Design a protein around this nucleic acid. Structure first.
Lengths: 62, 70, 59, 105, 95, 509, 16, 49
RNA sequence: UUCAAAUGAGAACUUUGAAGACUGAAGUGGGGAAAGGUUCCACGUCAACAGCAGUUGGACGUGGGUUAGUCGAUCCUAAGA
């Protein structure tokens, strides 16, 4: 399969880059069925696609 | 185009290159007996002219789409 | 098939204009089918009938 | 035939004099070699956790000794060569120093 | 866990019993087009036997170009017979 | 298995169909024979009635077959909406008088009306149909029983339908007893033999779509042309059998009917009083395209029934389409209209404002169905007219590739890879070409009779009966050749049924 | 030549 | 570009409508010499000025 | 650069995930002018091309897509014609 379009659309929907967004590899057919931002939003809320919180840059030392 | 119907009460036509928004308004009003709110035009990459036609809320695009056949 | 010029030459001006309008409506009705089916030969006949009527009028 | 065993492997002497940008993939290949030697099967499946354990200190900082669990298994596939395959997992322990190999239930 | 498991299992609707095993209603078209999409290559040709005839003919005529290693039916780069600059102390035209 | 739960569900599904049949046959006599409703107005009223009845009794339950009213040429599929009435006019405006009944909705005299419908509960279904006939009125008579019997080929057709119906009923009744059958135990060989000789006696050929078959839960044969199945025991009479009978999967040999089973009968007879010659009886589809041809005999229409192929999936871009797909898949695997899926459709009370509400909903549903159909999720159940072809054109034909001609842009696949007559190596595409390629474009009139039965010791006939499908008295000829094996057997069967036990379910008041 | 024979037999049956 | 003149856009539209292969129902014709489109164009191979 | 799985006849090169690194705000980022012209996006999809490979592609086949009273041209004049 090929979830390139889905990763792109999920990034554009959630408002982050593709480096963040995460696709669970088990729900592959359910993700590949999606070809629309509404479906990607459904997968965002149900817990199939998540946001991957930020890589930290601490300033304790500074 | 079909989504734009229910979205904005909008029809989508292919029209002449020699035409303009006034003529398109007049032609839709003459053929299909409807008042038009605005017309928006573009020229496609294949050389034709596309026109989005928004109808007033009095008239519904679904009726005209059923009347035409598509 | 289609119209006949010798038939139209007897007709009047208003009958000819009405026939032209009807042919234009029929052609438009066919052009919405033509986008779903590729082959639709009746359009040739009506499109040439329009030309025959216009020729008679100009004559 | 179907058996699981703990082992420890000295990667220092196997990677002695290896390019820094080749040290960790060489550790992967040497672990596959190790499993093939001990079990006698060509197909060897590492775990991504073992890959993480190798690549934790980057290409050129792999630990000198690692503690592995090699589990031989059947191939349930339709039909394949290598009717058995080895599956290597990591053992996360205090330190791999001072241990010897033992069979597991 | 047992509450959730007893809520989990299914009732096996009739949609399943009909169309689980079955598939391939409105089978695979060639160019992956919808019902109304205007396929130019194959609108005129109605039947599959002559469709295969035409495809085989195209594959037969493609060969001498594929031998010359063109990027398609559009690569017509034409190479000259000889270049003047390649044949020629002081200033020279190349290093 | 025939449990009490199964068979009482069959009964209460059947008698709803019976009383709805009585309702329609009520209404038509109210409208025409009595001192005026159109076809599509009858149809949704009948379906409203059936669902209003279904609500009282009983999870998967509803209408298997939407009520179809064929008229005088159509083998099956005619069941239009109220959307399409002006469309039918302004499409068929330039054509000729034929199909005027189906085009306008008003029925004429001498018009052979084949009604059919069905109802299902938890997958257990019951179909029924009846060929009735219009005949003008008596005015000087006080009671006004309408004047004149029928005489011609349509009369032939009705006679063959009724006689074939009763004979196959009796045969499947003797299926219980390995006795009480004239040896002149039971097989599709015998069934096809007796029905073919009845058809030959009355000079009315069998239509390709007709069949007699087994039923199981959710698997009746409602579609029979679109969806496939491996386990299908039953008999059909198509062009392959026509050519084989002229010479001398659906296997007929390894098929002997057994106890404890539910069966569907569906017989279609196409009359031949002209035609002059030997010839084939095939089917032609009706499209909405005026522009494919110039001839006036062609009918132009849009089918109303759909069916959705639950194996495929595709996210739609359109809100209306996705909501309509919800409404569809919450219904079952049986065909449906757009009117069935709505808010006000059963018509608890009925007025013009509710019909208007339904029309607006329909205007939205057609937009949804556009995208649902452009993607191959739902398909149309086609409108098929019976059409006659003489063997002369076929034998003089030229088919430069036989057994290899697909039709390639037919959308369903199963009517595409048919090969109706493997001998002579002609397919449906070239057969259509030959059917069109001739001024002998003779379309036949057809009569239809459909019943559902179950074998326990009695034959419990869940449809039919004398209240239902009592025949319009007619005046036919070619009335059943004596002096043969099979005819002796048939008459002995008819006499012996009076004792065999045939139970029949009555309609609901 | 099977089509020849079956068409011959079919002509035979339809002509009478 | 992106602020074209209509002349350039018209030429581009002609080029788009020309950018096709040859139909298959022309192979099947009596006395057909044509087997491919020799005036075919691609944005990367040849420029159309 | 690596590990597993998925897809597939076939995976060093495709997809997802798990790791390790890089550009390091005078970027391997986000947008534009000239030029190009559909290369954009989707669906199918491997004969030729991508100096290995290829299930992938700016390739091949078929479609979709560019909506302006307010952004620009259009108007003004500059050197000049």
């Amino acid at each position: 399969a090929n979830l390139r379009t889905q990763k792109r659309l999920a990034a554009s929907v959630v408002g982050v880059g593709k480096r963040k967004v995460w696709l669970d590899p088990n729900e592959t057919s359910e993700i590949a069925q999606a070809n629309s931002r509404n479906a990607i939003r459904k997968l965002v809320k149900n817990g199939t696609i998540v946001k991957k919180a930020v890589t930290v840059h601490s300033k304790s030392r500074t | 185009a079909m989504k734009k119907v229910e979205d904005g009460n909008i029809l989508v036509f292919q029209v002449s290159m020699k035409a303009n928004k006034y003529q398109i308004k007049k032609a839709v009003k003459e053929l299909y007996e409807v008042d038009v709110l605005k017309v928006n035009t573009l020229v496609r990459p294949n050389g034709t002219k596309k026109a989005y036609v928004r109808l007033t809320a009095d008239y519904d695009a679904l009726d005209i789409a059923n009347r035409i056949g598509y | 098939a289609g119209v006949k010029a010798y038939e139209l030459r007897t007709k009047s001006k208003e009958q000819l204009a009405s026939q032209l309008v009807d042919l234009k409506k029929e052609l438009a009705e066919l052009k919405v089918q033509k986008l779903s089916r590729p082959s639709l030969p009746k359009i040739k006949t009506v499109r040439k009938s329009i030309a025959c009527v216009l020729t008679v009028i100009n004559e | 035939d179907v058996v699981t065993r703990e082992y420890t492997i000295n990667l220092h002497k196997r990677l002695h004099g290896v390019s820094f940008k080749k040290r960790a993939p060489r550790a992967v290949k040497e672990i596959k070699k190790f499993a093939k030697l001990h079990m006698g099967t060509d197909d060897v499946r590492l775990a991504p956790e073992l890959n993480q354990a190798i690549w934790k200190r980057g290409v050129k900082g792999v630990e000198y000794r690692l503690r592995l669990r090699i589990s031989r298994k059947r191939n349930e596939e339709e039909d394949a060569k290598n009717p058995l395959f080895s599956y290597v997992e990591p053992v996360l322990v205090a330190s791999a120093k001072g241990l010897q190999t033992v069979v597991v239930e | 866990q047992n509450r959730a498991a007893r809520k989990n299992r299914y009732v096996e609707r009739g949609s399943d019993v009909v169309f689980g095993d079955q598939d391939a209603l409105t089978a695979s078209t060639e160019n992956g087009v919808k019902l109304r999409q205007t396929d130019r290559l194959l609108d005129g040709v109605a039947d599959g036997s002559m469709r295969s005839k035409a495809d085989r003919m195209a594959k037969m005529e493609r060969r001498e170009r594929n031998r010359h290693a063109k990027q398609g039916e559009s690569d017509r780069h034409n190479a000259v017979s000889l270049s003047k600059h390649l044949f020629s102390v002081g200033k020279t035209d190349f290093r | 298995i025939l449990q009490e739960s199964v068979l009482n569900k069959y009964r209460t599904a059947g008698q709803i169909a019976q009383t709805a049949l009585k309702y329609v046959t009520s209404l038509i006599n109210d409208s025409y024979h009595s001192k005026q409703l159109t076809v599509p107005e009858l149809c949704l009223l009948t379906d409203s009635f059936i669902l209003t009845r279904l609500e009282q009794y009983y999870n998967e339950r509803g209408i298997a077959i939407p009520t179809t009213i064929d008229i005088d040429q159509i083998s099956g599929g005619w069941c239009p909406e109220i959307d399409d009435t002006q469309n039918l006019l302004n499409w068929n405006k330039g054509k000729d008088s034929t199909f005027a009944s189906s085009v306008t909705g008003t029925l004429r005299p001498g018009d052979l009306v084949k009604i059919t419908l069905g109802v299902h509960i938890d997958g257990y279904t019951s179909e029924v149909s009846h060929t009735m006939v219009i005949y003008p009125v008596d005015e000087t008579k006080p009671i006004l029983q309408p004047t004149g019997p029928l005489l011609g080929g349509k009369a032939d057709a009705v006679a063959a339908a009724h006689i074939a119906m009763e004979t196959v009923v009796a045969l499947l009744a003797c299926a219980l007893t390995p006795e009480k059958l004239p040896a002149s135990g039971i097989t599709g060989q015998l069934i096809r033999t007796i029905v073919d000789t009845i058809a030959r006696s009355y000079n009315c050929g069998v239509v390709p779509g007709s069949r007699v078959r087994r039923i199981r839960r959710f698997l009746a044969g409602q579609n029979e042309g679109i969806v496939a199945e491996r386990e299908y025991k039953g008999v059909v009479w198509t062009e392959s059998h026509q050519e084989a009978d002229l010479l001398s999967a659906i296997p007929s040999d390894d098929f002997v009917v057994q106890s404890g089973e539910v069966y569907l009968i569906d017989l279609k007879m196409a009359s031949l009083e002209h035609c002059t010659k030997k010839g084939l009886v095939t089917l032609e589809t009706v499209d909405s395209y005026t522009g494919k041809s110039h001839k006036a005999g062609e009918l132009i229409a849009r089918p109303g029934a759909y069916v959705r192929d639950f194996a495929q999936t595709h996210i739609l871009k359109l809100k209306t389409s996705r909501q309509l797909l919800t409404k569809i898949d919450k219904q079952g695997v049986y065909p449906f209209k757009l009117s069935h899926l709505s808010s006000n459709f059963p018509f608890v009370h009925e007025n013009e404002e509710e019909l208007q509400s339904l029309k607006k909903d329909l205007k939205s549903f057609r937009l949804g169905m556009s995208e649902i159909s452009n993607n191959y999720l739902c398909v149309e159940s086609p409108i098929q007219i019976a059409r006659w072809v003489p063997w002369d054109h076929i034998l003089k034909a030229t088919n430069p590739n036989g057994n290899l001609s697909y039709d390639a842009t037919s959308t369903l696949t199963l009517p595409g890879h048919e090969l109706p007559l493997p001998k002579l190596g002609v397919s449906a595409i070239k057969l259509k070409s030959l059917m069109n390629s001739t001024k002998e474009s003779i379309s036949l009139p057809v009569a239809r009779e459909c019943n559902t039965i179950v074998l326990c010791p009695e034959l419990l006939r869940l449809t039919g009966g004398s209240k239902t499908c009592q025949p319009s008295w007619i005046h036919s000829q070619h009335e059943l050749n004596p002096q043969d094996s099979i005819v002796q057997g048939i008459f002995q069967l008819a006499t012996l049924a009076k004792d065999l036990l045939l139970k029949e379910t009555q309609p609901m008041k | 030549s099977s089509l020849t024979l079956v068409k011959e037999a079919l002509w035979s049956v339809i002509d009478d | 570009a992106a602020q074209k003149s209509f002349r350039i856009k018209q030429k581009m539209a002609k080029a788009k409508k020309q950018n096709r292969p040859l139909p298959q129902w022309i192979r099947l014709r009596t006395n057909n010499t044509i087997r491919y489109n020799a005036k075919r164009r691609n944005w990367r191979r040849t420029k159309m000025n």
